[PDB]
Amino acid sequence: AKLHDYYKDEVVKKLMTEFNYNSVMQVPRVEKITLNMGVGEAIADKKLLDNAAADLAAISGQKPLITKARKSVAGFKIRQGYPIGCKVTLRGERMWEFFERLITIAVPRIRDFRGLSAKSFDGRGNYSMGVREQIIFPEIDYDKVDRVRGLDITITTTAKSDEEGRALLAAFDFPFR
Amino acid sequence: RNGRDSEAKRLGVKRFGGESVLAGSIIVRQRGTKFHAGANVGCGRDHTLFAKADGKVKFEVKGPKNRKFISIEAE
Amino acid sequence: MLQPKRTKFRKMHKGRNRGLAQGTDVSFGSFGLKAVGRGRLTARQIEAARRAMTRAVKRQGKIWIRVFPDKPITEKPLAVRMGKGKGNVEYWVALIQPGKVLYEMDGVPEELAREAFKLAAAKLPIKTTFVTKTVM
Amino acid sequence: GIREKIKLVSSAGTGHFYTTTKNKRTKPEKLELKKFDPVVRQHVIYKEAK
Amino acid sequence: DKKSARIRRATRARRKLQELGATRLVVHRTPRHIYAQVIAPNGSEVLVAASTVEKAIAEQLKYTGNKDAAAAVGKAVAERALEKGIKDVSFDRSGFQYHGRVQALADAAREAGLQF
Amino acid sequence: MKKDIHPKYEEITASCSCGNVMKIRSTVGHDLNLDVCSKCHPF
RNA sequence: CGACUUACCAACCCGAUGCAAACUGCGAAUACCGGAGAAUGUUAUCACGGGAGACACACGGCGGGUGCUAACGUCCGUC
RNA sequence: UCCUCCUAAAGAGUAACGGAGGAGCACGAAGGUUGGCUAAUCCUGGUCGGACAUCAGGAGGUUAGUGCAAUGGCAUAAGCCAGCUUGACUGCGAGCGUGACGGCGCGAGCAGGUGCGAAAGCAGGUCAUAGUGAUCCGGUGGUUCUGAAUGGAAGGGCCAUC
RNA sequence: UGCCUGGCGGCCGUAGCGCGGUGGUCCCACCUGACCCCAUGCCGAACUCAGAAGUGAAACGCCGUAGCGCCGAUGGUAGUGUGGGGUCUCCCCAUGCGAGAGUAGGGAACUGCCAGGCAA
């Protein structure tokens, strides 16, 4: 919630001045974040979903929902109805809190960290990234987990193009490496 | 291996526009919905169109999709 | 040997050749071989005419085929009684109406096309004539 | 016709019964649907029976 | 779109009322100024309308878009219908849940003499 | 906001080696041991 | 980890030309159903009752399947 | 034998040892009602993940889907999800379609008693069209209808069903 | 009466898309919070509730623009009813009906009931 106060206080002015808009509310805003991982090994081992949801619930502030295959594909031997992944969506104040728990004490602890990619952008105002291990999250400490499973983070904004989308990211001081 | 066929079900329109009909008369026999029931016309489970009142059957077009409707005018 | 690939149905009704041609104008090249008679051309006939022209021009200019067989034709085996179902497909033919443009030429001298088309016409069962690209 | 036929007997004293079909192996459980009983003119529970 | 979703949701009821050929009470709900109208079977004429926009109805409501406002307009339309002579009407959700203000309007009409 | 289905979200304070102390809500546990943060890092 | 060329294969598309009994974003002429009106026809119409025969059809015109757009061939619709 | 299209000539019907395909089921839910939602195929980004898994945005507008072949239909959705349920109910049924007939199909409405919904209302199985077999002879249950001197029963009859 | 807006209709692509401009006194939308009603097969997203700080981007309404979709003649052609003829696997004549496509052009809507604000 600190950043939301940080966001409401001055960076809005900085965005306003930088983009010389005719109104403040044209400035983009973050509406939600989503977590996901298409494990896909549910057929091989069905009872891994429980831990898959449990870890994400610990990482996030609420329970996940398990998605289902949209269609039938012979290449992966899966059909609609059989769960293959789970996800969460964060919006409101919980999203604000999660973001700080990400930027503060998640990126620095990336194993063999080199730099956050900047070319990762859809082209409309949404940013996506992935992780390799849960260690960046304090809820995991190598004792109650034994899986190298990863996940993905997608942040969506009210931005209209890359230029203002990247500018908002720069305002939030992303690593930009 | 060919030569099989099914006996004709005699579908189509049984009463045409401007024709006075009695209540319960069948106006159209159809598989889907060629025509949609309007005022005083009911649609059966077979999509058959029957008149719920005595009058003259009228055809017209309504709706954004220019679908064809059948109604009965009490005149 | 022009032939449709993976046609919807193996056999089709004989139909009729009534009506009038549609592609009656030269639109691709500069010279065309219009057909004034009525009939059908087999794939074998179309191939023979095409070979005659490409060689007559001696690998020069462009040639377009404006007709495709796209119609299976059946034949009963010899010494087979009538009935017992439709016959098998042996060759494909195209339906040609008067005024249809069959072959079309470009990038060649005006005279050379005339003999080339004349040679091709000699190997077809239908009346044909020589036409030029009209300005609209 | 792998699906076979059954008989539903009204729980009431009257002998009125309905008939239907179900798959024994898929759902070997009994059927306790509530259906109209013309003899008594009430809706009562019908128990599946041979 | 929010608007497009409502019409699609309410279309089934509208068509059902139309073919039944009965007077319908249609309610439009917004963050402020809930609206209510009574439409004749033909659909081209409106018998009575009520809402909080009228100064004659808003001079005693502290806020517009509340249960009290919903009840007040519900009573206003109810008595307007009674004096106009119309008695039987069919309620229309217009794509709105029958949970809050819509419910608060419906019962107010029902207890005010507009049973349906 | 559904109840009795989500994990605990109690507020907990955490500190790192470089002297920065903050407070976050999560199911991390009882105490936190950190070495680096967003700042005070070889970035 | 950046990046680039192409004498060479080619998808999705765009322009132009066609084809289809089992394609239709279009669509007749006739035929058929219903209403009104005049003329004309030995009620030519319908219903009920007594008696039947017939239920191997042929050719011609038109619209088709089949055959080879062969048959005084074969199988349908209509006259 | 039955169902889909074509042949079939713009009502219906219409043959061939004419051209293509299916059916002899399934489902107490996939039925009823209420409430809600809206696909295929592509483009950009993104751990394993790569043409093709899941996630976010956009293009697209039914090319999806609809228990089963085909045709026709279906955004009010007949398509997808959930709650509560048994109207897949009994006795009738004006009036129609369809056949030489046996027969088959549609059906508002009335009575009794139910389910869903605040309510208007909807519900007499399933998006529709195949999933079926006459009569005889017999079996099981109900009903003093009958029961050959009378009182019973046997056996028939009626209703339900195999 | 007029400028405007909201609701329910008639008619439904001449009515729909694209591009540009414009709208906040009312209304509408976004928006603030949600301990309670209510809701997420997780999420104040949606749905619902309490409010109004802000605002007219989005969305929506209005205006402009033909860039598309769309509408569309007259004439000619195809086809065809009836009656005739022929070099009769096809076509012609007399007569009646007359497309489809395309061209000129039209076109970026009109209108009914109710309530409100503004200006008269």
UniProtKB/Swiss-Prot annotation, chain A:
Any one of the GO CC terms: cytosol
Pfam families: Ribosomal_L5 (PF00281), Ribosomal_L5_C (PF00673)
Keywords of this entry: Acetylation, Ribonucleoprotein, Ribosomal protein, RNA-binding, rRNA-binding, tRNA-binding
Record PTM N6-acetyllysine, positions in chain: 2
Single GO MF descriptor: tRNA binding
GO biological process assignments: cytoplasmic translation; ribosomal large subunit assembly; translation
Stated role: This is one of the proteins that bind and probably mediate the attachment of the 5S RNA into the large ribosomal subunit, where it forms part of the central protuberance. Its 5S rRNA binding is significantly enhanced in the presence of L18. In the 70S ribosome in the initiation state was modeled to contact protein S13 of the 30S subunit (bridge B1b), connecting the 2 subunits; the protein-protein contacts between S13 and L5 in B1b change in the model with bound EF-G implicating this bridge in subunit movement. In the two 3.5 A resolved ribosome structures the contacts between L5, S13 and S19 are different, confirming the dynamic nature of this interaction.
Note: Identified as a multicopy suppressor of the slow growth phenotype of an rsgA (yjeQ) deletion mutant.
Assembly notes: Part of the 50S ribosomal subunit; part of the 5S rRNA/L5/L18/L25 subcomplex. Contacts the 5S rRNA; cross-links to the P site tRNA. Forms a bridge to the 30S subunit in the 70S ribosome, contacting protein S13 and S19.
Protein name (database record): Large ribosomal subunit protein uL5
Curated annotation (Swiss-Prot), chain B:
The UniProt record lists the keyword Cell division: no
GO biological process: assembly of large subunit precursor of preribosome; cytoplasmic translation; cytosolic ribosome assembly; positive regulation of ribosome biogenesis; regulation of cell growth; ribosomal large subunit assembly
Xref: Gene3D superfamilies: 2.40.50.100
InterPro entries: Ribosomal_bL27, Ribosomal_bL27_CS
Keyword hit for Ribonucleoprotein: yes
Top-level taxon: Bacteria
Keywords linked to the UniProt accession: Ribonucleoprotein, Ribosomal protein, RNA-binding, rRNA-binding, tRNA-binding
A molecular-function term among this protein's GO annotations: rRNA binding
Cellular component annotations (GO), alphabetically ordered: cytoplasm; cytosolic large ribosomal subunit
UniProt subunit comment: Part of the 50S ribosomal subunit. Cross-links to the 23S rRNA. Cross-links to the A and P site tRNAs.
Matching HAMAP family: Ribosomal_bL27
Family the entry assigns: Belongs to the bacterial ribosomal protein bL27 family.
Protein's name according to its UniProt entry: Large ribosomal subunit protein bL27
Protein's organism: Escherichia coli (strain K12)
Gene assigned in the entry: rpmA
UniProtKB/Swiss-Prot annotation, chain C:
Positions bearing N-methylmethionine: 1
Entry's Gene Ontology cellular component terms: cytoplasm; cytosolic large ribosomal subunit
Coiled-coil portions: none
Record keyword Glycosyltransferase present: no
Keyword Ribonucleoprotein part of the UniProt annotation: yes
Keywords on record: Hydroxylation, Methylation, Ribonucleoprotein, Ribosomal protein, RNA-binding, rRNA-binding, tRNA-binding
Superkingdom of the source species: Bacteria
Residues the record lists as (3R)-3-hydroxyarginine modifications: 81
Molecular function terms from GO: rRNA binding; structural constituent of ribosome; tRNA binding
Gene Ontology biological process terms from the UniProt entry: cytoplasmic translation; ribosomal large subunit assembly
Modification comment: Is hydroxylated on Arg-81 by RoxA. The modification is nearly suppressed when E.coli is grown in anoxia.
Family statement: Belongs to the universal ribosomal protein uL16 family.
Role according to the record: Binds directly to 23S ribosomal RNA and is located at the A site of the peptidyltransferase center. It contacts the A and P site tRNAs. One of the last ribosomal proteins to be assembled in the 50S subunit. The simultaneous presence of uL16 and bL36 probably triggers ObgE's GTPase activity and eventual dissociation from the mature 50S ribosmal subunit. It has an essential role in subunit assembly.
Subunit organization: Part of the 50S ribosomal subunit. Cross-links to the A and P site tRNAs. Interacts with assembly factor DarP(YjgA).
Record protein name field: Large ribosomal subunit protein uL16
Gene encoding the protein: rplP
UniProtKB/Swiss-Prot annotation, chain F:
Subunit structure as annotated in this protein's UniProt entry: Part of the 50S ribosomal subunit.
Cofactor note: Binds 1 zinc ion per subunit. Only 1 ligand appears to be Cys, the other are thought to be His and either backbone amides or solvent.
PTM-bearing positions, type N6-acetyllysine: 8
UniProt similarity note: Belongs to the bacterial ribosomal protein bL31 family. Type A subfamily.
Entry PTM: Proteolytically cleaved by protease VII to yield a peptide lacking residues 63-70. It is not clear if this is due to protein degradation or is a bona fide processing event in the strain used in PubMed:339950 and PubMed:10556732. In strains B, D10, MRE-600 and Q13 the only protein seen in PubMed:10556732 was full-length; the last 7 amino acids were sequenced only for strain MRE-600.
GO CC list: cytoplasm; cytosol; cytosolic large ribosomal subunit
RNA-binding in keyword set: yes
Species of provenance: Escherichia coli (strain K12)
One GO MF term: rRNA binding
Intrachain disulfide bonds: none
Record keywords: Acetylation, Metal-binding, Ribonucleoprotein, Ribosomal protein, RNA-binding, rRNA-binding, Zinc
Swiss-Prot/TrEMBL cofactor(s): Zn(2+)
Sites where the protein binds Zn(2+): 16
Signal peptide (from-to): none
Coiled coil: none
Any single biological process term in GO: negative regulation of cytoplasmic translational initiation
Name of the protein in its database record: Large ribosomal subunit protein bL31
Annotated function: Binds the 23S rRNA.
